[PDB]
Design a protein around this ligand. Sequence first.
Ligand SMILES: CC(=O)c1cc(-c2cccc3nccn23)c2cc(N3CCOCC3)ccn12
Ligand SMILES: CC(=O)c1cc(-c2cccc3nccn23)c2cc(N3CCOCC3)ccn12
Lengths: 113, 113
Amino acid sequence: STPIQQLLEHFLRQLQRKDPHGFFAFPVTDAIAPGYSMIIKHPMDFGTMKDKIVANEYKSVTEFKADFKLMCDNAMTYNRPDTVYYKLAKKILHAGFKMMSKERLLALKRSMS
Amino acid sequence: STPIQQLLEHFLRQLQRKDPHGFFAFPVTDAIAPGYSMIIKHPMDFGTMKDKIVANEYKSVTEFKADFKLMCDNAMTYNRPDTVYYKLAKKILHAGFKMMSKERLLALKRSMS
Ligand SMILES: CC(=O)c1cc(-c2cccc3nccn23)c2cc(N3CCOCC3)ccn12
Ligand SMILES: CC(=O)c1cc(-c2cccc3nccn23)c2cc(N3CCOCC3)ccn12
């Protein structure tokens, strides 16, 4: 493993801790969600993200954050605001952007010296 | 080696990065996957594709792509959608369609002036 894979595994672990039930842990199949595939064209979930970390597909924290955002944006588009899925997506999104803020990453860069 | 062999080795290396465990590295046999030769008439894998590049058997990207798509198609026919092998095939197929799209190859041709 590389140091960047470890850092991303850390962020992913901390995010998934906020989805106890695993709503975001696996892909959304049409069996689970009728016609999902008709609405959401670029699906994403935590499991796909872990596989990309293992394949060493992320060049940057920015790329990881873009997948994370896409996953949350999907959930807030497929699901109405009054759902558990929409509300948790929104909570998750904010937590992730605090965790991986420019300010947090600058302070981490300084500690890499 | 020749320029086309070098371009194909490049595309192959980038595709193989998507399969870090090497599930697509070697041929599927009936000893590995029950009843494979019944469903799949023309097996293909990354090892075979590498051997064909080295032997200079591919005359065009189209010919190379055809093997890549065959490999993915085989896995998406034999395996159920809920399997690692299906999901990975779909992942490889998407990467390859992006990398070797008509528009990408156009851009490459333009740079060969
Ligand atoms: C992220 C997301 O949008 C999502 C996740 C589920 C879901 C719910 C339960 C298990 C599960 N595994 C993978 C996804 N899920 C899920 C389930 C939805 N349903 C839609 C209505 O039918 C009942 C379940 C709608 C949306 N979702
Ligand atoms: C590409 C593909 O369809 C594939 C690859 C494997 C596989 C799995 C493990 C070792 C291996 N060596 C060569 C191929 N493999 C493999 C194994 C399969 N099995 C499914 C049934 O359980 C026994 C193994 C089903 C499909 N596959």
